[PDB]
Structure formats: structure tokens, C-alpha cells
Amino acid sequence: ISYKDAKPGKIDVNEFKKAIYLLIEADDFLYKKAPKHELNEEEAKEFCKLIIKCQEHLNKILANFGFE
């Protein structure tokens, strides 16, 4: 997986905005769990859900440039 293999494509704006929104939601954990930022099991699931969805959207974005 290299960026140099990127072929011309179109930026899916919706998917990008979704990923951004997910990272913004995940940014809440930086606040409500400061300053130790240690999560329990359920909190970990809730946070990692956001992160994983985000990476999913990012993969959908990369798909438009010749990746899989």
C-alpha cells in the first residue's frame, strides 16, 4: 500500500465529511476523559467504533483512486 500508486480520480465529498464528523465525535473522548485518557471496555468499544467507521470511509475515499 503506497500513495505513489494513486491513479487520478474524484474526491467523494460526502464520505470525507462523514470521516471528519466521526473524528470530531471521537474528539469528545479527549475532553470527557482527560487528563488520563484511559478508557474502560465499553468506552473502548464506543471510541474504536468511531475510529473504525472513520477508516472505513477513508478506504471508500481511497477506492476512487485505484486502491482496494
Binding site: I20, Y21, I24, D27, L30, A34, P35, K36
Partner: protein
């Protein structure tokens, strides 16, 4: 000729890495919805409907957006009072009241305390007296201002009394709700107020300079007085277009705010928990007891004693708070500390309290 490096690494703050105890910021923290709105409009909104809705939220006739309580107070002082008129306010008033009074070329009369140490409660009836003492001297009183909750002791005041007095004497009444609107529910008509100023960045979960000026129909013609050259543009508003980031964050945080005021007793619960738990280690809560607001001022002889011998002087506490990821307390000061836990998670409240206890326990 100009060093620009001081603006390069500007992207740095302890906002996510630390717990902020500064009372002037607890109520101005943006919810995620507001953050998304920021991402959307950081250079580019049902404003009229929002003004009607914020008017209903305060039970008031009309409302306009401002750049804070500061601006609103200057607005009412500049549009309602004539140069030379007196403004009678409480002794716990914010500096912006005095300054806005001075910018409007108005004089100031203070109202004494019902009790000083350690309560510092304002004698609300005294207002009446203070007015007459001015009217006997032939002076003209143009405005009666009351800080609903002061920024020093965080005391709540029965605004309905001063409302009654102002209604009797026939003098317009301005209620400074900078520390009120957005935290607790507030009824403008019920307390018999003619003007209400709210701070969006202090208590309404907004950023930037952001505020609201609510007012009754009686003064609607004066406040929203349009210009001669441009019959659409309001004079005092300097152009009825109020755009930018703060108003967007305010409108975006509006549902979050109207919902969090219904859960004000929980934040009060947090507050009283902190007070009760800290008075065990030697802290003494100043102001009215029990607490009716999140802003707490503690008298702390212990901290001063620890700072005495020896450590790093009064800067010890600050340092000892930075080690545990806590800020918001002024560095160097130990004779007294001012803090608020409004909006903090309960686990974070426990963390803060236990942190402080450990601080005073470890530093002997």
C-alpha cells in the same frame, strides 16, 4: 523586520490534555454539534427564528445578538440613558458594567452588602434607598443594573425584588445574566426585568465574542432604532447582519443549552459535592451557603501555609496541579482559589477533588 515564527507553532494548547477549572470557561465549552458547525462555517442559519426562540427561552418580548454581555450593557446604556444619568448597580458588579457606564458618559452608584465576610451578599432592598439618595440630590437615575450572579463569589440574587423596586420607581431594569442564561432557567417577565444581557461564550456553550440582549416591547423602538440614511440598518447594532463563527456556534449549541438548563440541579450537585468534600481538608467556601451556582471561591489558609515554607512559593499549587493534568487556577495565588466543575464528568469531578486532597496531603 517582523518575526513570524511566533504564529507558526501557534497550533498548541492543553485543552484536550488538561482539566480546565476556570469558571469563566466552564459554560462556554462547545458540544460536538457546535464543533461540526464550526467545521462547516469557519469562513462562510435561521437567525430571525433563533432570535424569536431565544426571546421565548427567556420569556421576553424581543431579542438581538451581540458580542457579549459587555456590548449589550453598552447598548442599553447608550440608547436608553442620557449623558449624566446615574446607573445604580451592586458592589459585586463586573468591571464591564462600570466601563460601559463610563463609555456611555454615565455616573455610577453602588449598593452595599447585606453582609460582608464571608458571605458578601448584596442588600437588595438597599437599592431603593440608594435611588432616593440620588433623587433627593436632584440627580437623575437612568438605569438599575443587577448582576444576577457575580464573577467573584458566584452568589445568586433574588432579581424579583429589584424588579419590583424598579417597577415602582419606574426606572428601567437591566439584569446581568452573563453567569445565568445557559446554565439555569431564567424568566425575564417573572423577575420584572426590562433588559437582559447574556454571554454566549461564558454560559451558552458558544465561542468567540458572543452574546444576547433581550428587551421588552416598551423599549423596542429605542433599542432597534433604525438609521436615517439606511432605514433597514439598526443604529445600535451597527448593521443588523450579525454574522460569523460565534452566532453559528450559539445557534448550534442552542438545543444543547435548552436541555442542560433542565439538568441544572445535577451541576449544583457536583458543586456542593466539591464544596463539602474540600471543606474537610481546610478549605472554606466564601459567598452564600449553600451554593446556588457552579462558581466557587475558596479561602485556603493551608495552601498559603504550604507556599510559605517552602516549595516554589505560591506557584507550588499551580505546578502541583499541572503534574496531575489540571489547570484553570491562577498561578502564584494561594490565599484563595477560584474554581468551577460545571459540565465535568462525575469521574472527572472525583479526579479533581482527590487530586487536591492528595496535593495538600503530600506537600504537608
Amino acid at each position: 523586520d517582523i518575526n513570524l515564527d511566533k504564529y507558526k507553532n501557534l497550533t498548541r494548547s492543553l485543552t484536550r490534555e488538561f482539566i480546565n477549572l476556570n469558571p469563566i470557561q466552564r459554560g462556554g465549552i462547545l458540544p460536538k454539534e457546535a464543533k461540526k458547525a464550526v467545521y462547516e462555517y469557519w469562513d462562510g442559519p435561521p437567525i430571525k427564528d433563533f432570535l424569536e426562540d431565544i426571546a421565548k427561552f427567556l420569556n421576553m418580548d424581543c431579542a438581538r445578538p451581540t458580542h457579549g454581555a459587555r456590548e449589550g450593557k453598552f447598548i442599553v446604556m447608550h440608547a436608553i440613558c442620557k449623558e449624566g444619568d446615574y446607573v445604580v448597580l451592586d458592589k459585586n458588579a463586573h468591571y464591564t458594567s462600570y466601563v460601559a457606564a463610563e463609555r456611555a458618559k454615565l455616573n455610577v452608584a453602588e449598593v452595599g452588602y447585606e453582609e460582608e465576610y464571608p458571605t458578601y451578599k448584596i442588600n437588595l432592598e438597599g437599592y431603593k434607598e440608594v435611588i432616593d439618595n440620588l433623587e433627593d440630590k436632584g440627580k437623575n437615575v437612568g438605569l438599575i443594573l443587577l448582576t444576577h450572579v457575580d464573577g467573584e463569589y458566584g452568589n445568586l440574587n433574588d432579581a424579583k425584588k429589584v424588579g419590583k423596586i424598579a417597577k415602582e420607581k419606574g426606572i428601567p431594569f437591566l439584569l446581568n445574566c452573563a453567569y445565568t442564561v445557559g446554565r439555569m432557567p431564567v424568566n425575564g417577565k417573572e423577575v420584572k426585568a426590562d433588559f437582559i444581557v447574556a454571554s454566549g461564550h461564558k454560559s451558552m456553550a458558544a465561542s468567540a465574542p458572543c452574546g444576547i440582549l433581550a428587551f421588552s416591547e416598551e423599549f423596542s423602538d429605542k433599542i432597534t432604532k433604525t438609521s436615517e440614511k439606511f432605514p433597514v440598518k439598526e443604529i445600535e447594532m451597527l448593521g443588523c447582519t450579525s454574522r460569523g463563527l460565534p452566532i453559528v456556534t450559539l445557534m448550534a449549541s442552542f438545543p444543547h443549552v435548552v436541555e442542560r438548563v433542565k439538568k441544572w440541579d445535577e451541576e449544583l450537585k457536583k458543586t456542593r459535592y466539591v464544596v463539602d468534600e474540600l471543606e474537610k481538608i481546610g478549605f472554606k467556601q466564601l459567598g452564600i451557603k449553600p451554593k446556588e451556582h457552579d462558581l466557587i471561591k475558596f479561602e485556603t489558609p493551608v495552601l498559603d501555609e504550604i507556599a510559605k515554607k517552602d516549595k516554589r512559593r505560591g506557584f507550588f499549587f499551580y505546578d502541583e496541579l499541572k503534574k496531575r493534568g489540571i489547570g484553570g487556577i491562577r498561578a502564584g495565588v494561594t490565599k484563595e482559589i477560584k474554581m468551577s466543575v460545571y459540565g465535568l464528568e462525575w469521574e472527572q469531578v472525583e479526579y479533581v477533588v482527590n487530586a487536591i486532597k492528595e496535593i495538600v496531603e503530600s506537600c504537608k
